Amino acid sequence: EPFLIGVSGGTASGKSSVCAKIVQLLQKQVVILSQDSFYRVLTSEQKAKALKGQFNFDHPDAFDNELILKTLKEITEGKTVQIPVYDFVSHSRKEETVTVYPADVVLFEGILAFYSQEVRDLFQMKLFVDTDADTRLSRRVLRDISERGRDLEQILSQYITFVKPAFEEFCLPTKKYADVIIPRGADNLVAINLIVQHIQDILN
Ligand SMILES: O=c1ccn([C@@H]2O[C@H](COP(=O)(O)OP(=O)(O)OP(=O)(O)O)[C@@H](O)[C@H]2O)c(=O)[nH]1
């Protein structure tokens, strides 16, 4: 069975980078999947909210949890799967899909990957990335403006109204489920090294 590794942390905490550095340091076939690929398909009314940064994309229910549970279960079974592609500029699931063939190690990262216990128990290892809040926001702002075509004021408004409150209420609590907590994120090469060393040992 593939070795499942769940990765979480707050928004722009560097979960993706951590996953990349882990793969970089890890022949084993490895693939990185993100919880973001499974955001729910929004109605026109909800999408309208999103355009004004008035939609909560940080609440457990913003994700298509059923699809996630099912997709991850199939990977666990060694079956090749199809994975959705989300568009952050339109807040909409694209028609195109991405094929993901079997692998020895699978990394799953998302702001709420440890929330649902069903999903949580599918991970043989769970990592939580801990980064300073102002550092996280700074990134969020530049990344949102740069890669997701958004406006500063709409970003800050959505962050203060939804992201932060959701982080404290839904995300942060899940840190208790982590087997390893990683402060400073991707930059904590020592912690990442022990982790890849631990992953390597188990695969032996
Ligand atoms: O349509 C959407 C969907 C999601 N989001 C917002 O994206 C946010 C989280 O998605 P992430 O911040 O976790 O991005 P990432 O997977 O690349 O993480 P890092 O590697 O940078 O750590 C959530 O905080 C959600 O509100 C939107 O702004 N719009």
Swiss-Prot record:
Q: Name one GO cellular component term.
A: cytoplasm
Question: Which controlled-vocabulary keywords does the entry list?
Answer: Acetylation, ATP-binding, Kinase, Nucleotide-binding, Phosphoprotein, Transferase
Is Nucleotide-binding among this UniProt entry's keywords? Answer: yes
What are its E.C. numbers?
Answer: 2.7.1.48
Tell me the enzyme class: transferase
Q: Which GO terms describe its biological process?
A: cellular response to oxygen levels; CTP salvage; feeding behavior; response to axon injury; UMP salvage
Q: Give the pathway.
A: Pyrimidine metabolism; CTP biosynthesis via salvage pathway; CTP from cytidine: step 1/3; Pyrimidine metabolism; UMP biosynthesis via salvage pathway; UMP from uridine: step 1/1
Query: Can you state the subunit structure given in the record?
Result: Homotetramer.
What's the protein called, per UniProt? Answer: Uridine-cytidine kinase 2
User: Could you read off the lineage of the organism from its UniProt record?
Assistant: Eukaryota, Metazoa, Chordata, Craniata, Vertebrata
Q: Which gene encodes it?
A: UCK2
